Amino acid sequence: VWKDADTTLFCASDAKAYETEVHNVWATHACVPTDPNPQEIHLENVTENFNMWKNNMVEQMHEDIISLWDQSLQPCVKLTGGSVIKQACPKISFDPIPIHYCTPAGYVILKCNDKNFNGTGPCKNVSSVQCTHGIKPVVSTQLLLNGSLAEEEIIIRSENLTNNAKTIIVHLNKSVEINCTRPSNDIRKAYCEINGTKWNKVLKQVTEKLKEHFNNKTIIFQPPSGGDLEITMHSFNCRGEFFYCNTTQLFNNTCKGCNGTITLPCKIKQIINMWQGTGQAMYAPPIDGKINCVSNITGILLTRDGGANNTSNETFRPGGGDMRDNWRSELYKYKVVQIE
Ligand SMILES: O=C(O)CN1CCN(C(=O)N2C[C@H](CO)C[C@H](C(=O)Nc3ccc(Cl)c(F)c3)C2)CC1
């Protein structure tokens, strides 16, 4: 037997001693080797309750990535509320590795295997594990990149869909590749390429889903409605440089003559509004050469518009901000229980 519980966890990863990539370096000195012979035990006829939106694993993971980034990203200037900390800003090596989260002696992780699980509520196929799977801690906005895929249909996730303040995580079942380049030799201009057909058909499918959850209303996509660039743009980090990308072309409800390659305009930014805590950080101009990342779009962060009850439509805008949602998109199937 086992009661819901909250303990300190420990991490595991196959990081490399000689690799100077920051994620490996942090995982070398903060985690242990991954479990060599894992084994999950299936709890026969057991039904368990899960709550992805009220899970402490997420906060512990969040703290980890805040520390990783605090030890690894070295901005030339940092401007946190009166503080103006200055320091050398060498260009660093950057590429996330999977991180496992593991329970201490006396606790275990239950793993929801219900292929249509939405994150909250009950779960009939429950298995126990000592460690989560390898989770890449990919920091980004608007789009979830390089995560897992939904096992069956496209899953919709929300602490409470009725409430229009709580964010709507969409879990795709078919990844969409995003290919972003800063060509070699204005060195701050860059662009991401997406297959239109692939994208647009997926967005169609997403529309289907949202309609079912909203009395099959009219579903409208629009770009953010004000805010800072980290919010109005799809932001992420590629090879250490902060890419901001305009995603207006993706939320074009019109799509006809739009089945080709979608090129979204992007810029690398040196001054960013940080996500760890309040403050600004200045980095040095970008490295030379063809800076590129090819990534899987695996989920979308939506925020539904308020004050529409009295109409026949529901409009959604891409909506990042709280990184804890990124972690939630992989941790949704897990929960810690104190063993009895
Ligand atoms: O705990 C919370 O809910 C808020 N925390 C307290 C302090 N924070 C903020 O003030 N902001 C506000 C600001 C715009 O308003 C955008 C910030 C952001 O996400 N920047 C960002 C930088 C680099 C990358 Cl690659 C990226 F994907 C995103 C989030 C952080 C979270």
Ligand SMILES: *[C@@H]1O[C@H](CO)[C@@H](O)[C@H](O)[C@H]1NC(C)=O
């Ligand atoms: C429960 O999950 C497992 C994966 O761990 C998979 O075989 C299937 O979805 C379920 N199996 C049984 C026997 O219920």
Ligand SMILES: *[C@@H]1O[C@H](CO)[C@@H](O)[C@H](O)[C@H]1NC(C)=O
């Ligand atoms: C998730 O499933 C539960 C039923 O187990 C339901 O109560 C809840 O409303 C669902 N949430 C979403 C977003 O589908």
Ligand SMILES: *[C@@H]1O[C@H](CO)[C@@H](O)[C@H](O)[C@H]1NC(C)=O
């Ligand atoms: C991208 O998606 C494909 C299939 O959807 C998968 O095989 C591949 O591993 C993914 N790439 C990354 C970097 O996760």
Ligand SMILES: *[C@@H]1O[C@H](CO)[C@@H](O)[C@H](O)[C@H]1NC(C)=O
């Ligand atoms: C993904 O789920 C949708 C329903 O939202 C379904 O129509 C589609 O066929 C699924 N795609 C795959 C590859 O399972």
Ligand SMILES: *[C@@H]1O[C@H](CO)[C@@H](O)[C@H](O)[C@H]1NC(C)=O
């Ligand atoms: C709008 O929708 C919310 C949630 O469905 C509801 O509580 C509220 O009464 C509705 N209308 C107004 C005018 O607030």
Ligand SMILES: *[C@@H]1O[C@H](CO)[C@@H](O)[C@H](O)[C@H]1NC(C)=O
């Ligand atoms: C979900 O949100 C709606 C709108 O704010 C609210 O009326 C309802 O009570 C909420 N449900 C829960 C369980 O908090």
Ligand SMILES: *[C@@H]1O[C@H](CO)[C@@H](O)[C@H](O)[C@H]1NC(C)=O
């Ligand atoms: C990504 O784009 C670059 C330039 O647009 C191209 O050279 C490269 O082949 C592309 N890679 C993939 C996997 O599409």
Ligand SMILES: *[C@@H]1O[C@H](CO)[C@@H](O)[C@H](O)[C@H]1NC(C)=O
């Ligand atoms: C784009 O997507 C379609 C449909 O998924 C696929 O058939 C095609 O090979 C992809 N690439 C190009 C260049 O059209």
Ligand SMILES: *[C@@H]1O[C@H](CO)[C@@H](O)[C@H](O)[C@H]1NC(C)=O
């Ligand atoms: C994205 O591009 C459109 C036009 O293509 C522009 O009107 C919009 O302002 C751009 N987004 C931002 C955040 O500047």
Ligand SMILES: *[C@@H]1O[C@H](CO)[C@@H](O)[C@H](O)[C@H]1NC(C)=O
């Ligand atoms: C996604 O995975 C690919 C392959 O490992 C990597 O090249 C790319 O940098 C990743 N994207 C991000 C944003 O981490």
